[PDB]
Amino acid sequence: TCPFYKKIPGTGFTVDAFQYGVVEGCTAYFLTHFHSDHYAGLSKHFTFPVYCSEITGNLLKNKLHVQEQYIHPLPLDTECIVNGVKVVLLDANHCPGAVMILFYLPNGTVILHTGDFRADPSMERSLLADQKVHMLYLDTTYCSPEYTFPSQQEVIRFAINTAFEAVTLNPHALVVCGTYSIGKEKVFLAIADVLGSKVGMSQEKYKTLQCLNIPEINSLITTDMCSSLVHLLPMMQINFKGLQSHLKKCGGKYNQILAFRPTGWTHSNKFTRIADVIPQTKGNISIYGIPYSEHSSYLEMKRFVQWLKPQKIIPTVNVGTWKSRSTMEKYFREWKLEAGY
Ligand code: NI
Angle between helices 152-169 and 185-194 (to 10 degrees): 40
Contact 115, 38 (CB under 8 A): yes
User: What are phi and psi for residue 178, nearest 5 degrees?
Assistant: -75, 150
Ligand 1 centroid distance, CA of 98 (Å): 8
Assign 199 to helix, strand or coil. Answer: strand
- The closest of 136, 134, 33 to 89, measured between CA atoms, is 33
Q: What's CA 203's distance to the chain center, in Å? A: 22
How far apart are alpha carbons 95 and 301 in whole angstroms?
Answer: 17
Compute the distance from residue 138 Cα to the ligand 1 centre, in Å: 13
Ligand 1 center to 257 CA (angstroms)? 29
Q: In what order do the strands lie in the sheet with 285-291?
A: 221-222, 199-200, 230-234, 173-179, 256-263, 285-291, 280-282
Which DSSP helix (H) or strand (E) runs through 163? helix 152-169
Distance of CA 237 to the CA centre of its chain: 21
Backbone phi, psi, residue 183, to 5°:
105, 155
Gap between the Cα atoms of 7 and 314, Å rounded: 11
* Whole-angstrom distance, CA of residue 257 vs CA of residue 330: 46
Closest CA to 232 of 174, 165, 291, 168: 174
Contact 152, 52 (CB under 8 A): no
Cβ atoms 76, 90 nearer than 8 A: yes
Distance from Cα 294 to the centre of ligand 1, integer Å: 8
- What strand order describes the sheet that includes 50-52? 7-8, 13-15, 28-30, 50-52, 71-73
CA of 329 to the centre of ligand 1 (A): 23
Residues in the chain: 341
Cα 263 to middle of ligand 1, angstroms? 13
Burial class (CB in 10 A: 0-12, 13-18, 19+), 277: middle
Q: Is 314 helix (H, G, I), strand (E, B) or coil?
A: strand
Q: How remote is the CA of residue 35 from the centroid of ligand 1, in Å? A: 5
From residue 319, give the alpha-carbon distance in Å to each of 31, 223, 301. 20, 41, 17
* CA atoms of 321 and 277, how far apart (whole Å): 33
Structural method:
X-ray
Contacts of 292 (CB under 8 A, 6+ apart): 152, 155, 156, 184, 187, 262, 263
Q: Which domains does the chain have, with CATH numbers?
A: 1-147+296-341 (3.60.15.10), 148-295 (3.40.50.12650)
**CA 94 to ligand 1 center in whole angstroms:** 7
Ligand 1 centre to CA of 244 (Å) is: 31
